[PDB]
Amino acid sequence: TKSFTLPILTISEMTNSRFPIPIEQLYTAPNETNVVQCQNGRCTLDGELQGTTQLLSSAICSYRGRTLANNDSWDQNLLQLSYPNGASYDPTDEVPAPLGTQDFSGILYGVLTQDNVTEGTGEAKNAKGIYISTTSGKFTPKIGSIGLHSITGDVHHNQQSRFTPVGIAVNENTPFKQWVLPHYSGSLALNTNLAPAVAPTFPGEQLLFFRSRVPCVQGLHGQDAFIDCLLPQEWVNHFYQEAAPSQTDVALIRFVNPDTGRTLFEAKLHRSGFITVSHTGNYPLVIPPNGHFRFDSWVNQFYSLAPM
Amino acid sequence: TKSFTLPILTISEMTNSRFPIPIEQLYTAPNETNVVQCQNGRCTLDGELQGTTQLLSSAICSYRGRTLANNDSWDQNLLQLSYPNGASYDPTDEVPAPLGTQDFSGILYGVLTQDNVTEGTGEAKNAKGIYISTTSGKFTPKIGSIGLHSITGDVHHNQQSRFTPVGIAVNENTPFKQWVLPHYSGSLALNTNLAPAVAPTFPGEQLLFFRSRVPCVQGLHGQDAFIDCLLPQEWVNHFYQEAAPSQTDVALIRFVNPDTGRTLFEAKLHRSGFITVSHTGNYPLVIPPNGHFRFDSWVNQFYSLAPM
């Protein structure tokens, strides 16, 4: 059997699998009312991608397609989504939405670029500041269309356009809810083909998250906007490449200080692609910057982790 | 000895190592007057990062630091840099510039985000559209500071800030020159610690590039802006992880169709981290979307490739 492995990376050498920014922290907390069911960054340990997960961090929360004028004060345009190649999106694919589609509720902010303009048009005149809100009835990426609310710049009708994500935004009636999935089909249909929700099931355990601060371009004054993922993008890509057979349901892993060899904590890496630790309460881990994970062994369902 | 390998990735499954966007094409061209000496996406086959190369595509052309008011006409603020991971930047570090610094001459466009603002401040009011020009006298990232030119938004003095790249720009006196390295110390000092320039040394050979179209927010009307890299970011990260010893100075690689194994063409993968092919002239390669490179064997500098 091909041996299971992890890449050797410090946490600042990891990318959030739900937004194209580096990991900053490890964080554990109880689920309490959150249904932890993100659709990006989902991969089994033997290499099966799930949800809307694909391999490129530069495609997470990125969209492209053709703009269409829309008679609405919020979504002045729609984006008719296309694959990177240029073909129209196919809603019959067995996925929740185009791969990389945002998997949090609220407003995604970024920049739309369109047909290039002459230099004399002015500075950054082919850059449009855009809000993509999931509370809009026009957010229907599974059907092949999303709504664009423009803030700066004139969005041209019927031009091949790219959206580059920058951060999130909170306005007066649209909170940022990272654990509330969008309705990928709007009100036409419920979500389909979802990666499963995850939770600790062993006494005393909590999920462990790879945590980043996402830029927030409106609202959340004096507050941190966090985006938490279950696997860094580098682990998704590693498991996809390696496709090592999963020998049990749980891979025992440990986070070590490479200088002293000390185990800072051990953790369960579940075969469906998430981590639990033995802890009770909200806890941003205090860990040395050079620490990294190592794979120990495949364990059974009744392994009791050392408290951390 | 650990065997050298390449990741199993199609070209649309890889990221440009000089700008955070997916690869779109393979492209070969003669060097003619270009000094091909990019500093991002530089890595030896045995895993030694060079130039300004680091591991995260989400850090390429990204900057972070503290803003400082400036009385220049072009740059209303400077950004006092750190490393993209947040580690303090010392100009005495043995690098050309902070890792991920842009390695093309011209204008980089993106969005600065700063301290979060109240909802009532307005839409995208913590998003500033920025030009970072390498021809500005304040582009001195090696010294620890770059100039920020405001287009949209009010850049705040003395705030911790993040710059997210979106594309490039061409104004009336600043062309986009992807093979002219910036002066990382401006006119104050010469460039240091550079990864070497590369060129075909064998008869009938040209460099093979991984090519993307970069968004252009001003200028280049009717034209596509291209950014060409020597190695995909995923190859950089793979060589860094594997650190397989290079048995000779040249690895023979084959671009194959994985279904059957038929070789479409062969190429030389050089020890310092670049590819050559046997071709004369500018040529965007025609390749099936499912093809990928595969390591064949170690050869020398005088292996004669089949023309392609």
Numbering used by the authors:
A (entry chain A), B (entry chain B): 3 to 310
Paper text:
Human noroviruses (huNoVs), members of the Norovirus genus of the Caliciviridae family, are the leading cause of acute gastroenteritis (AGE) and are associated with almost 20% of all AGE cases worldwide. The major capsid protein (VP1) is composed of a shell (S) domain and a protruding (P) domain, and the P domain is further divided into the P1 and P2 subdomains. The P2 subdomain is the main determinant of NoV diversity, antigenicity, and glycan binding patterns. In conclusion, GII.13/21 huNoVs have developed a novel GBS that interacts with glycans via the common β-Gal through a unique glycan binding mode.
A more important factor contributing to the low prevalence of the GII.13/21 huNoVs may be the GBS of the GII.13/21 huNoVs, which is easily interfered with. The function of the GII.13/21 GBSs appears to be easily blocked or inhibited by low-level glycerol molecules, suggesting that other small molecules with a glycine link structure also inhibit the GII.13/21 GBS. Indeed, we also detected a glycerol molecule in the GII.13 08N2045/2008 P dimer.
